[PDB]
Amino acid sequence: DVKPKSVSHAKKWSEEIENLYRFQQAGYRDETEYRQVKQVSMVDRWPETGYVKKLQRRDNTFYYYNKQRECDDKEVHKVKIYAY
Amino acid sequence: TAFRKFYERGDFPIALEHDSKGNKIAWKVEIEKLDYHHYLPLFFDGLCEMTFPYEFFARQGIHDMLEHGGNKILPVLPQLIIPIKNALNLRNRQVICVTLKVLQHLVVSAEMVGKALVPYYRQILPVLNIFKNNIGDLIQETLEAFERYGGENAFINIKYVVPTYESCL
C-alpha cells in the first residue's frame, strides 16, 4: 500500500522513461507496483543497458523487451511519471 | 552476504579508495541517478555485515543514499523490510544498534516513509522486546522516532508489538 502521490506525463525520452514505458506496457505503473503485485526477487534487466528484459503480466503471460530502446519518440508523451 | 557479492562487483557504485582527508566515500556514480529499487536493498543487505571492509561501505553507503535519496526512498520501502528483519533477527547487539540508528534515519529521510513503515512494525519490531531495557534507550529512542513520524496509527501499532512501550512525545 505504498502508492504514488501524483502523475505527470513525460516530455523527453530517458532511461527512466524507457523502463517506465516497459512497466506500463505490461500493465504496471512502475517497479513499485510490479513488485507489489508479483512475488519478485529480481527484475530481469539487460546487462549492458539496464533496461527491463521481461515482465510477468497480471494474467501470468510474459512480455519480453529488446536490449535496445523500444519507446519511440511518438510514445514518450504517453509514459506516466508517478511521484511518491 | 549478498552485499559481499555486491561489493567489488561491477555495478558496485562506490570507489574503493581511502583519502586521508576524512572518512567520506567516493561515489563512482551520482547517487541521484541510481535505481534505488536495485541499490538501496543491496546496501541494506549489508546491515548484517560486521567484517571490516564491508561494514564501512554498507553503513556509509546507506547513510548517503538515505540523506540524498529524496523521493526515491519511499517507492523502495517494501524491499527493505526483509533486510531490516534479517539484521535484527541475528540478535547481535551491534547489528541491532547500527540498524536502529538506520531506522531512525529512514523515517526522517523523506515524507511519508515513517507512516508507510507502520504496516511492517509486526515484522521488524519483535526482536526489540528481547533487548527492551546502550541498547535499551536506543530502542526507546527509535520507537519514539517511529511514532513521531508515523502518523495517527503509529503508537497503537508500536504497542501491539511492544506491549511495554510508552511515550508522551
Curated annotation (Swiss-Prot), chain A:
Which UniProt keyword terms apply here?
A: Differentiation, Spermatogenesis
Q: Does the keyword Disulfide bond belong to this entry?
A: no
Q: Look up the record and report any one GO term of the cellular component aspect.
A: cytosol
Instruction: Identify the InterPro entries for this entry.
Output: Meiosis-expressed_gene_1
Enumerate the Pfam families for this protein. Meiosis_expr
**Which processes are annotated in GO (biological process)?**
manchette assembly; protein localization; sperm axoneme assembly
Stated family: Belongs to the MEIG1 family.
Oligomeric form and interacting partners: Interacts with PACRG. Interacts with MORN3.
User: What does this protein do, in the record's words?
Assistant: Essential for spermiogenesis.
Protein name per the record? Meiosis expressed gene 1 protein homolog
Q: Which organism is it from?
A: Homo sapiens (Human)
Gene this chain is encoded by: MEIG1
UniProtKB/Swiss-Prot annotation, chain B:
Q: Which residues form a coiled coil?
A: none
**Keyword Cytoplasm: yes or no?**
yes
Which molecular function term from Gene Ontology is one that the record holds?
beta-tubulin binding
Query: Which GO terms of type biological process are on file?
Result: cellular response to unfolded protein; flagellated sperm motility; protein localization; spermatid development
**Which Gene Ontology terms of cellular component type are present?**
axonemal B tubule inner sheath; axonemal microtubule; cell body; cytosol; glial cell projection; manchette; neuron projection; nucleus
Main subcellular location of this protein, as a coarse class = cytoplasm
Tissues where the protein occurs:
Expressed in all immune tissues, spleen, lymph nodes, thymus, tonsils, leukocyte and bone marrow. Expressed also in heart, brain, skeletal muscle, kidney, lung and pancreas. Expressed in primary Schwann cells and very weakly by monocyte-derived macrophages the primary host cells of Mycobacterium leprae, the causative agent of leprosy. Component of Lewy bodies, intraneuronal inclusions found in the brain of Parkinson disease patients.
Q: Where in the cell is it found?
A: Cytoplasm, Cytoskeleton, Cilium axoneme; Cytoplasm, Cytoskeleton, Flagellum axoneme
For whether the record's keyword set contains Cytoplasm, the answer is: yes
Sorted alphabetically, the keyword list is: Cell projection, Cilium, Cytoplasm, Cytoskeleton, Flagellum
Kindly state the subunit structure of this protein.
Microtubule inner protein component of sperm flagellar doublet microtubules. Forms a large molecular chaperone complex containing heat shock proteins 70 and 90 and chaperonin components. Interacts with STIP1, PRKN, GPR37, HSPA8, TCP1/CCT1, CCT2, CCT3, CCT4, CCT5, CCT6A, CCT7 and CCT8. Interacts with MEIG1.
Protein task: Microtubule inner protein (MIP) part of the dynein-decorated doublet microtubules (DMTs) in cilia axoneme, which is required for motile cilia beating. Suppresses cell death induced by accumulation of unfolded Pael receptor (Pael-R, a substrate of Parkin). Facilitates the formation of inclusions consisting of Pael-R, molecular chaperones, protein degradation molecules and itself when proteasome is inhibited. May play an important role in the formation of Lewy bodies and protection of dopaminergic neurons against Parkinson disease.
What extra comment accompanies this record?
Linked to PRKN in a head-to-head arrangement on opposite DNA strands and share a common 5'-flanking promoter region.
> What is the protein name stated in its UniProt record?
Parkin coregulated gene protein
Question: Which source organism?
Answer: Homo sapiens
Question: Which gene name does the record give?
Answer: PACRG
